[PDB]
Design a protein around this ligand. Structure first.
Ligand SMILES: Nc1nc2c(ncn2[C@@H]2O[C@H](COP(=O)(O)OP(=O)(O)NP(=O)(O)O)[C@@H](O)[C@H]2O)c(=O)[nH]1
Ligand SMILES: *[C@H](CC(=O)OC(C)C)n1cnc(-c2cc(OC)cc(C(F)(F)F)c2)n1
Ligand SMILES: [Cl-]
Ligand SMILES: [Mg+2]
Lengths: 1001, 203, 129
């Protein structure tokens, strides 16, 4: 029914087209869906453009005419060149006529702005093709027709707006360099006439709709036009006064002045300086008298969201911050400008109180710009003392929750642990801390007064609330480091005393959890204080140990994070023997570790052991450190020694769910301690290494056996997942130590050999769904650290993992995403640290290597694509190093022209644009090899033939010119890339000018 | 019941279709099936001001599947622009999608969404996302996989479209369920032996 | 002087509450598809003493489960989880029409799963009477 439109043998039924369009937009369900696939096919018809003429004059549906212009847009963009001058002149004529038609019908011009904007845009597409070479009178004719009708004038402003955008704003990656410069130079040559028109209607225009469209085009012009059109005319006076009073022009006027406000002014010119001050003085005046005074409550206005107030306040914030970040120095020296400077900043203070995350970030960025300048610039901070004093209040009252604070209130009003990590407020908190740290440095007394005073009104209760005590505590913690040690001492003392009093007064686990999180954060932020008073440090730690038994999981988790946070800064005070103490405190901690961690979860127990490891590594006496390490690992070592007696006895026990979990936690504990101790962990590793690799083997047997007896689904069961967890923690432990080992000799001589015998064969002889990608990640670290010391070891790694892993990932880009990523990280480091291993590969395997590198090229996944291109780049370098030997010669005979064609494919397929830069770099490297050694004639021959068959719509000259330019520029990457982008533009159309490739000539 | 046309635009692979499906059925589609042209989906939310219905035009982001392209934006009353915080190129193309959108829809509420904040290796830093400021767009970090801020875009649009900044999502009424054997024991067996996805998640 | 100044769950008791993620099996596609994550509640009607499951999604609060805890329903384990249960349901009205589903529900821990099973069976005895 609706498909008769698709049959082009018969004429087009416009009345039917109008209904198909109506069904798609105003319809629903299957009727709408079917009309969608039909309209798509009608548009995709290469001959649909021929029906555009009749649709535009015999259609009643504006949407149909819109789709018609879209069809013409495709043609004008891609095939305008091959179009006989018969159609080119005609299409221009009825598009122009259509535009004139609508501007005369005041009803159409009012109600169908969508179709007029589209038509105007389609005309701009023609201008890009024909103007000014084949249409030199367009501008003088456009200006002449402006006076005939107010609608014509307004619409011409729209055309010029879209023109400026397509030429200056969105031309970079849509035209060739040559054409872009041609169109930019054209507009620049005739802009004087455009500006005179624009300026005349601005001074003598009463039609707001016309004034706005003129101001819209002006905003685009400001992106590029010479400064003289801005400051040498009267236009700044118009924008900053006349057009700020009417709301319908205020938004666009403010955006215009924002652009002006960002311009870098020649600092030597006093007339621009005075002029830059003037339009700012006027703008603030019009705002204070026509919108709201400086005392207005912008917070409330924004929340009410009446009309365009929210958008206006956003634009005002953008204008003030933009202008002041650039030109505030113009206002700081002259006393007559002081009130203007401070009034503007007072508006920003009021804007900063608005409840709007993104708007606050915008103002906060400016405040950072200001306080940082007041921190370094002499004689400036006294100007803003009142502004800064207010700002300290703003920031302190709007501190966002830092990541260390793990408690939050839900919809029932109960304090619970956070489900998710609020990742989008971490950055905000760090920005707030930066500004508040500056403000504290600018007047440390004022900041203490505000915080102490606020803390008082929390005790007396006049302002008590969870939100008020949280923001205050967070602010207190954030300014750590700004005060002197003595000031900080009494400041922290006072804060603790008062927060403890609240913990007493406030009852109920909800109130108790809030204060607990606030004190822990404050204390964690002031290690300098804890260091200076051992009594304080000890008391804190022992109270953190108490909180590890608390039933509220929030308090419990934060106590462990705070413990390790304090240890990272005060570790030294745990290894020394403090006066009035019998032994270092690490002795006490290790001793009671079982009691202290009894109620913790495995993850939390591991954090505790990791913190202990941090402390142990501060002991630089090997004997005492190793003794402490042995004492710390007593519990896991006892459970480990017990379990190896049973894994030897009957491996059937490993089927026990609880035994598996115990093993995993033992190894996770060794991982945690190794993470914080690094090379010093070697003794504990030697205690378990050989038996641990034996366990790895025994666990591998059970996994393999389980799969065969239950199928591949076994890998999903808890039992197998638990067994695989053991293997992955063992590899993680070995990988953690090797990555931090100082003694690489013992790594090679002791660890590497048993490791490879235990993991490689198992990996190779498992079914794909049972292979752990962690093996590859582990081998990568081995090669990275000792690869240069084990040439035969690297070879053995390749044989076991290379071919069997490639067959897993070479059937699509989807399956085994981890193996895919780790696989190419391993090849990457091998190619760098032990390229000799690839020379030992038989010619067949080395062919698979090349096939694997190019396979990575074609990934959209950035984790794989990047490493694929890097390997290619480094593999070329590796061959070039070999000089003129048989292997190098054979490589160029067999694989050079594969890399060339494969690199060119991803450069031009429009589906790998993310890697353009590295693609171009690799291509430049390949080409440059030939132009250093003829070999150069054949390369041009090959490339010319390749591109001819791959892009048959290009002429021989286009390809010839492109390769001439590309081969001359294989030493200038910036120009080399510009030539490729020109080529990518020309392959999307027909008839591209081959002289465009002489742009850099 | 009020109706509003919402267009959803963004580079291919940024998660537009996954985001819509999550709100439609609660599922998380792990596979990438490129959308063709556009898929319209009715979506209803319950608010203290009554139910609000969005007609979501989930357009295709890939070039070769654009279909009518800017023809889908006609008469849209709001929009979402989507990009991927793990792919810098998707943020670089935000200005292009916005350009084509506001050329048709001069004055509509638009939300800019940076999706996939669940992934560890984030490539588009928070400090770099600033395009929404001069264009008066609302911005949210979101994650269709973790549901992080997944309701914010529609909540904000609903407040702008209804004109009530205090509008809230409310619990839909829960009617009483009714009281009540061959090919069930067969379907149950299959579902029993098909492992649940994402067994490592906290839920 | 006198100055003049300026969910359909209320009739039900909450027997049990727990966080969970609900799946529904797509037989054709042959895979599990999430349906919602939030609080799973056992609600006993004070008038009829009939107990049902009601589960709403976080944030949107849309219903992803609403059905009687039928006495003939049976909870079975999933092959790849020790903190989930699967069972068939012949009438769920979360999305409107009383459809039949094979549901799976997963919890934060095995403990919460086992406790869910205990309360699920308690509710089945209540519905029996
Ligand atoms: N890790 C993660 N992956 C996501 C997230 N959202 C979507 N994805 C994944 O991104 C891929 C593409 O999803 P899709 O919705 O089809 O993207 P699209 O924008 O609709 N593509 P197109 O424009 O071509 O139709 C899917 O595989 C999906 O699993 C997310 O929030 N986090
Ligand atoms: C209040 C918090 C609280 O007790 O809540 C729990 C969950 C019931 N509160 C009381 N005492 C402290 C306190 C005392 C300390 O002695 C110096 C040290 C801390 C520490 F957390 F900072 F270590 C806390 N908190
Ligand atoms: Cl040694
Ligand atoms: Mg899609």
């Amino acid at each position: 029914s609706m498909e008769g439109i698709l049959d082009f043998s018969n004429d087009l039924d416009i009345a039917l087209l109008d209904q198909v369009v109506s069904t798609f937009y105003q319809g629903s369900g299957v009727q709408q869906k079917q009309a969608q696939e039909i309209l798509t096919k009608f548009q995709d018809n290469p001959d649909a453009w021929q029906k555009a003429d009749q649709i535009l004059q015999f259609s009643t549906n504006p949407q149909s005419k819109f789709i018609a212009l879209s069809i013409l847009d495709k043609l004008i963009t891609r095939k305008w060149k091959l179009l006989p001058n018969d159609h080119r002149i005609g299409i221009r004529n009825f598009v122009v006529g259509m535009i004139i038609s609508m501007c005369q019908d005041d009803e159409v011009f009012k109600t169908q702005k969508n179709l007029i904007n589209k038509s105007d845009l389609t005309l701009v597409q023609i201008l890009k093709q024909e103007w000014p070479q084949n249409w030199p009178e367009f501008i003088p004719e456009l200006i002449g027709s402006s006076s005939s009708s107010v609608n014509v004038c307004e619409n011409n402003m729209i055309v010029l707006k879209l023109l400026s955008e397509e030429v200056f704003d969105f031309s970079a990656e849509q035209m060739t360099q040559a054409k872009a410069l041609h169109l930019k130079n054209s507009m620049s040559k005739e802009f004087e006439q455009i500006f005179k028109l624009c300026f005349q209607v601005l001074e003598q225009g009463s039609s707001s709709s016309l004034i706005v469209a003129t101001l819209e085009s002006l905003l685009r012009y400001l992106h590029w036009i010479p400064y003289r059109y801005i400051y040498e005319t009267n236009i700044l006076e118009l924008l900053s006064t006349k057009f700020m009073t009417s709301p319908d022009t205020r938004a666009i006027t403010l955006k215009c002045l924002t652009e002006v406000s960002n311009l870098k002014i020649p600092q030597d010119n006093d007339l621009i300086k005075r002029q830059t001050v003037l339009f700012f003085q006027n703008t603030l005046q019009q705002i204070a008298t026509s919108v709201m005074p400086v005392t207005a409550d912008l917070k409330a206005t924004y929340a009410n969201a009446n009309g365009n107030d929210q958008s206006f306040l956003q634009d005002l914030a953008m204008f003030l911050t933009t202008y002041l970040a650039r030109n505030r120095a113009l206002l700081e020296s002259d006393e007559s400008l002081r009130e203007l400077l401070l009034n503007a900043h007072q508006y920003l203070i009021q804007l900063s109180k608005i409840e709007e995350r993104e708007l606050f970030k915008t103002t906060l960025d400016y405040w950072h710009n200001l306080v940082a300048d007041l921190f370094y610039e002499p004689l400036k901070k006294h100007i803003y003392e009142e502004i800064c004093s207010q700002l300290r209040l703003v920031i302190i009252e709007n501190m966002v929750r830092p990541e260390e604070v793990l408690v939050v209130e839900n919809d029932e009003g109960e304090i619970v642990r956070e489900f998710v990590k609020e990742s989008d407020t971490i950055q905000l908190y760090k920005s707030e801390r930066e500004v508040l740290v500056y403000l504290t440095h600018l007047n440390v007394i004022d900041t203490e007064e505000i915080m102490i005073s606020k803390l008082a009104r929390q005790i007396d209760g006049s302002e008590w609330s969870w939100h008020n005590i949280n923001t205050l505590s967070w602010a207190i913690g954030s300014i750590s480091g700004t005060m002197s040690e003595d000031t900080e001492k009494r400041f922290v003392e006072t804060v603790i005393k008062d927060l403890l009093d609240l913990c007493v007064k406030k009852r109920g686990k909800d109130n108790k959890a809030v204060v607990a999180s606030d004190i822990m954060y404050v204390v964690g932020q002031y290690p300098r204080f804890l260091k200076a008073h051992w009594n304080h440090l000890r008391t804190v730690i022992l109270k953190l140990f108490e909180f590890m038994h608390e039933t509220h999981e929030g308090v419990q988790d934060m106590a462990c994070d705070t413990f390790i946070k304090i240890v990272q800064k005060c570790k030294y005070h745990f290894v020394i023997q403090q006066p009035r103490e019998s032994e270092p405190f690490i002795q006490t901690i290790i001793r009671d570790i079982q009691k202290t961690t009894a109620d913790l979860q495995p993850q939390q127990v591991h954090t505790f052991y990791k913190a202990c490891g941090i402390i142990i590594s501060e002991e630089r006496s090997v004997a005492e450190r190793n003794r402490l390490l042995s004492d710390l690992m007593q519990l896991p070592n006892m459970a480990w020694d017990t379990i190896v007696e049973q894994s030897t006895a009957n491996p059937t026990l490993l089927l026990d769910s609880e035994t598996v979990k115990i093993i995993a936690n033992i190894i996770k504990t060794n991982v945690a301690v190794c993470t914080s101790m690094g090379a010093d962990f070697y003794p504990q590793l030697g205690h378990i290494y050989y038996n641990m690799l034996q366990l790895y083997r025994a666990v591998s047997s059970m996994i393999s056996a389980q799969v065969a007896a239950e199928g591949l689904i076994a890998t999903k069961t808890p039992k197998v997942r638990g067994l695989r967890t053991i293997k992955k923690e063992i590899l993680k432990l070995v990988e953690t130590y090797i990555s931090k080992a100082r003694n690489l000799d013992d790594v090679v001589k002791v660890l590497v050999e048993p490791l490879l015998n235990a993991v490689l064969e198992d990996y190779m002889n498992n079914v794909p769904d049972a292979r752990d990608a962690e093996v590859l990640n582990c081998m990568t670290t081995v090669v990275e650290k000792v690869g240069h010391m084990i040439p035969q070891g690297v070879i053995l790694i390749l044989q076991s993992v290379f071919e069997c892993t490639l067959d897993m990932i070479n059937k699509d880009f989807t399956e085994y995403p981890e193996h895919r990523v780790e696989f190419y990280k391993l090849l990457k480091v091998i190619n760098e640290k032990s390229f000799a291993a690839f020379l030992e590969l038989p010619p067949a395997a080395f062919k698979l290597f090349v096939d694997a590198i190019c396979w990575a090229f074609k990934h959209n996944n950035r984790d794989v694509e990047v490493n694929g291109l890097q390997i290619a780049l480094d593999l070329v370098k590796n061959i070039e190093r070999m000089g003129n030997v048989p292997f190098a010669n054979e490589f160029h005979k067999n694989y050079f022209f594969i890399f060339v064609s494969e690199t060119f494919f991803v450069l031009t397929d429009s589906d790998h644009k993310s890697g353009f830069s590295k693609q171009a770099l690799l291509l430049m490297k390949l080409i440059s090899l030939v132009y250093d050694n003829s070999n150069q004639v054949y390369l041009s021959q090959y490339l010319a033939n390749m591109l001819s068959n791959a892009f048959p719509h290009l002429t021989s000259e286009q390809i010839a010119s492109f390769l001439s330019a590309l081969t001359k520029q294989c030493k200038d990457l910036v120009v080399f890339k510009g030539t490729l982008r020109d080529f990518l533009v020309q392959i999307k159309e027909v008839g591209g000018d081959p002289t465009d490739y002489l742009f850099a000539e | 019941q009020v109706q509003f046309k919402l267009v959803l635009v963004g580079d291919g692979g940024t998660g537009k279709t996954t985001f819509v499906k999550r709100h439609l059925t609660g599922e998380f589609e792990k596979k990438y099936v490129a959308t063709l042209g556009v898929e319209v989906h009715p979506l209803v939310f319950h608010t203290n001001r009554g139910p609000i219905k969005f007609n979501v035009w989930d357009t295709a982001g890939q070039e070769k599947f654009g279909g009518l392209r800017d023809g889908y934006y006609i008469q849209a009353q709001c929009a979402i622009i989507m990009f991927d915080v793990t792919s810098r190129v998707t943020y670089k193309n935000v200005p292009n999608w916005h350009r084509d959108l506001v050329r048709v829809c001069e004055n509509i509420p638009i939300v800019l969404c940076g999706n996939k904040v669940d992934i560890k290796d984030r490539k588009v830093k928070a400090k770099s996302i600033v395009f929404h400021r001069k264009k008066n767009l609302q911005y949210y970090d979101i994650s269709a996989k973790s549901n992080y801020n997944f309701e914010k875009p529609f909540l904000w649009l609903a407040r702008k479209l209804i004109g009530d900044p205090n509008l809230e999502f409310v619990a839909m009424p829960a009617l009483a369920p009714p009281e009540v054997a061959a090919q069930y024991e067969h379907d149950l067996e299959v579902a029993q032996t098909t492992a649940l996805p994402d067994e490592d998640d906290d839920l | 002087i006198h100055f003049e100044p300026v969910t359909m769950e209320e009739d039900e008791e909450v027997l049990y509450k727990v966080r969970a993620k609900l799946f529904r099996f797509d037989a054709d596609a042959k895979e599990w598809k999430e349906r919602g994550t939030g609080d799973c509640k056992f609600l006993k009607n004070k008038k009829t003493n009939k107990v049902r499951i009601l589960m709403r999604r976080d944030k949107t609060l849309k219903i992803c489960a609403n059905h009687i805890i039928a006495p003939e329903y049976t909870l079975k384990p999933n092959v790849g989880s020790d903190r989930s249960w699967v069972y068939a349901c012949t009438a769920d009205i979360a999305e409107g029409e009383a459809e039949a589903f094979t549901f799976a529900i997963r919890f934060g821990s095995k403990e919460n799963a086992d406790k869910f099973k205990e309360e699920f069976e308690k509710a089945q005895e209540i519905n029996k009477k």
